[PDB]
Ligand binder design. Structure first.
Ligand SMILES: CC(=O)Nc1ccc(N(C(=O)Cn2nnc3ccccc32)[C@@H](C(=O)NC(C)(C)C)c2ccsc2)cc1
Ligand SMILES: CC(=O)Nc1ccc(N(C(=O)Cn2nnc3ccccc32)[C@@H](C(=O)NC(C)(C)C)c2ccsc2)cc1
Lengths: 306, 306
């Protein structure tokens, strides 16, 4: 029992982190097969940050403009033999395949989804933590500028699914990045301009999962006979910065295991949103919306209702 | 910017996890050089879990009683050639040295310290998270049945410092384990027999570090001209379930870079202990006490205010 922010083990990803340097800019890259991925803003000099011409920058660089090095494990200096843009990513082809390339896929995650982040600095892994893609397609992580190129991923059946490369910090504690097809998460540009975020929202289904986790962990004071219809909840959600609720099988199974209905949990959200009455749930006095139903399922596996 | 629960990257530790089976019981072990460590209660049948005679169990076991396998990476079946007891740990000697043994040390952390945990199941690493040793020397983690033998650790300069092997759950979300000298944290016993936990307390020095981290991240509404001297806060602490405050250099450094005095933070604590009055700090409406001053230093390295 217990519920904590848990990440996927980072070893397979650590084997792929490298340092990329272009001019006086340096950040992290991801080395898979004969390719190194890193944010394209590595090419942009500080004085062009507000209006970069990335097409111009790209072909103003030679291959030997890029220095790519692996600092950890089997160290190496890697020769770049081609460079091109993939959306807001720079794709460096190098002349040696990473012998430690894991089995991997690329995916783009949806708002509400969690993934693990390996934070890196200067081509060295420094920390691991888990984030959730926010309603406005940002994340709440912990990064420095040198952390650009840090990698988000999930893991299943020994396959690493790479889903995020860190690109920038928008506002205090608020970050975004791109998937590895080079599409930036959200409506964000890799420029130095004031950009406005769409308003964030609590992810309802994640809050519901969290409330089920709580009940399975013996915390159930917030459960009342009170229920609210899904249609009524969703109306209310529109005006109170919560996502619409749509049921899933895993939520139904958490309901079955606890004996607490989905409608009771949505009612509890409406009451709790108004205030926690000086009480806590799994140690918090605010709604937690970064646990998916799948994240919860992993940490309550085999846990029996009491 | 941003402050999250960060763990040390797990790759170096993943390479040392194995599965240990003794009769009907299976759990995780840690393989370093020619040694495999695992909890000694692997020797105990479901029956005599109530009052095990570990000394008798030990002599009834032969080296062939113990099956040790590596299921990940370079797989391996390891032959046990000696076994001895080390407090609440079993120390198995195997005929093959782990080729991927990292540079390592052992240590025993003190209440208030943080460390990373690699949750394991059937000898397979499944997740990483960070915990904090509570005032009563328990940790608030997330552990399921076959997670015994899961490993806690910190990183010290290319050196893995092993500090914890998971032993048992005491109550919902409440766990303990041993250092690798085989001394149980909290002196709890590896018996069934329900044991009384000392009362937990908020770690004052960590709360203070968290408030500094808040101030360093633009959240500063709680700071008042109000001060309260250390001597006075400590008297108050004894009656309100906080640990007594003792100044350290890292705290001084943070007070220094914030311009906010320790006495001001202690004041905020007494006030915030009364209530957050509807407001939040770093998104929470409760006092966070699981970030050490060093943890915070790390995530505020190279950060200047507003
Ligand atoms: C030569 C040089 O200085 N290059 C550079 C500068 C800034 C960034 N940005 C980051 O977010 C860098 N970054 N990424 N993670 C960070 C965490 C803390 C601080 C900064 C962080 C973007 C941005 O908007 N930054 C401000 C300062 C306005 C917030 C950006 C992207 C393309 S152009 C500008 C990227 C590259
Ligand atoms: C064959 C067999 O039954 N083996 C076995 C089972 C359980 C444990 N325990 C764990 O905490 C195992 N453990 N460790 N973390 C857990 C999280 C959830 C559930 C179980 C967990 C202890 C305990 O509390 N057990 C009761 C029965 C009270 C539940 C314990 C420690 C020394 S003696 C007994 C140890 C060995």
């Amino acid at each position: 029992s217990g519920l904590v922010k848990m990440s996927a083990p980072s070893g397979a990803v650590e084997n792929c982190i490298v340092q990329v340097t272009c001019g006086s800019m340096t950040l992290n890259g991801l080395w898979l097969d004969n390719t190194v991925w890193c944010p394209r803003h590595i090419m942009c000099p500080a004085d062009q940050l507000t209006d970069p011409n990335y097409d111009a920058l790209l072909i103003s660089k030679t291959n030997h403009s890029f220095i790519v090095q692996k600092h950890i494990g089997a160290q190496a200096n890697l020769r770049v033999v081609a460079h091109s843009m993939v959306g807001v990513l720079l794709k460096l082809t190098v002349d040696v395949a990473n012998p430690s390339t894991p089995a991997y896929t690329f995916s783009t995650v949806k708002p509400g989804a969690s993934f693990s982040v390996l934070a890196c600095y200067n081509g060295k892994p420094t920390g691991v933590f888990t984030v959730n893609l926010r309603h406005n397609s940002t994340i709440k992580g912990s990064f420095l500028c040198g952390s650009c190129g840090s990698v988000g991923y999930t893991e299943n059946g020994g396959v690493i699914n790479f889903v995020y490369m860190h690109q920038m910090e928008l506002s205090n504690g608020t970050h975004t990045g791109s998937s590895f097809d080079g599409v930036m998460y959200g409506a964000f540009e890799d420029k130095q301009t004031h950009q406005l975020q769409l308003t964030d929202k609590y992810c309802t289904i994640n809050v519901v999962a969290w409330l089920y986790a709580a009940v399975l962990n013996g915390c159930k004071w917030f459960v009342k006979p009170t229920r609210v219809g899904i249609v009524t909840y969703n109306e209310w959600a529109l005006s109170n910065q919560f996502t619409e609720f749509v049921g899933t099988q895993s939520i139904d199974m958490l309901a079955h295991r606890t004996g607490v209905s989905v409608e009771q949990m949505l009612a509890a959200i409406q009451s709790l949103h108004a205030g926690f009455q000086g009480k806590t749930i799994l140690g918090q006095s605010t709604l937690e919306d970064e646990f998916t139903p799948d994240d919860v399922n992993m940490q309550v596996m085999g846990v029996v209702m009491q």
